Design a protein around this ligand. Sequence first.
Ligand SMILES: C=CC1=C(C)/C(=C/c2[nH]c(/C=C3N=C(/C=C4\NC(=O)C(C)=C4C=C)C(C)=C\3CCC(=O)O)c(CCC(=O)O)c2C)NC1=O
Ligand SMILES: [O+]
Length: 242
Amino acid sequence: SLTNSSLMPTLNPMIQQLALAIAASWQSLPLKPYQLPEDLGYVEGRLEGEKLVIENRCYQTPQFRKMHLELAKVGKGLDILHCVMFPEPLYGLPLFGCDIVAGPGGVSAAIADLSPTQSDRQLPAAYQKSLAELGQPEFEQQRELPPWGEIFSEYCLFIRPSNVTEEERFVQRVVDFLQIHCHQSIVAEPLSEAQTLEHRQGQIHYCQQQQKNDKTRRVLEKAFGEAWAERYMSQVLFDVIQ
Ligand SMILES: C=CC1=C(C)/C(=C/c2[nH]c(/C=C3N=C(/C=C4\NC(=O)C(C)=C4C=C)C(C)=C\3CCC(=O)O)c(CCC(=O)O)c2C)NC1=O
Ligand SMILES: [O+]
């Protein structure tokens, strides 16, 4: 749980709410710890500018090879929540991810998705059906995905929330995604070796494309340098499996 977090009480309220919702969804799963490189938990660094503070929590279950919740703060103003549930390819589940970035003046970016791992870039039929049933959410300020964002599903939300009502609507949609995802993980069956390979490739591709995110990289570089940032992005955030 998040009562021991040093960052949490200082983060944007939407970020606090979403972190609680994610922890609540994971709490009663068959969790084991997942050891990050160098058993990383808390880390802080500064070069010539602002300090970056990061808290990492990571778990695994039989269906999810790596469940990573990262909270971060740059200086006084910039707050970040990062979460990815990396599936075990044997079960063919999609990739849950979300990213929230907030400054003093409010949340600038809120993105969440259940991303495909199939070569045809479609979600499994059960997900399509369940997601369609939620209906189209209405948000006033949508943002267009960057070029490397071809990895995201047609259900991807990428917005700037315009008011508290939209903040709460976005959090609820993420809770709905997680409820669907946790349910489908109970009914998933181990796949064939050939299908497992296809899902593994989809996850590798997701990770390679997420590494092209310069907005993330530049934050890390300004606090820790180029070599540290490359190691962090490739080995901690978006590790390529074999
Ligand atoms: C220490 C960790 C960490 C940092 C520092 C970080 C920074 C970060 N991510 C950003 C955007 C972004 N973040 C994402 C998406 C994602 N990013 C993910 O990590 C995941 C899992 C998704 C999607 C599920 C996208 C698409 C953008 C916008 C990129 C752009 O505008 O070019 C931005 C710009 C925000 C804005 O334009 O308003 C910053 C500063 N994100 C982090 O996770
Ligand atoms: O991650």
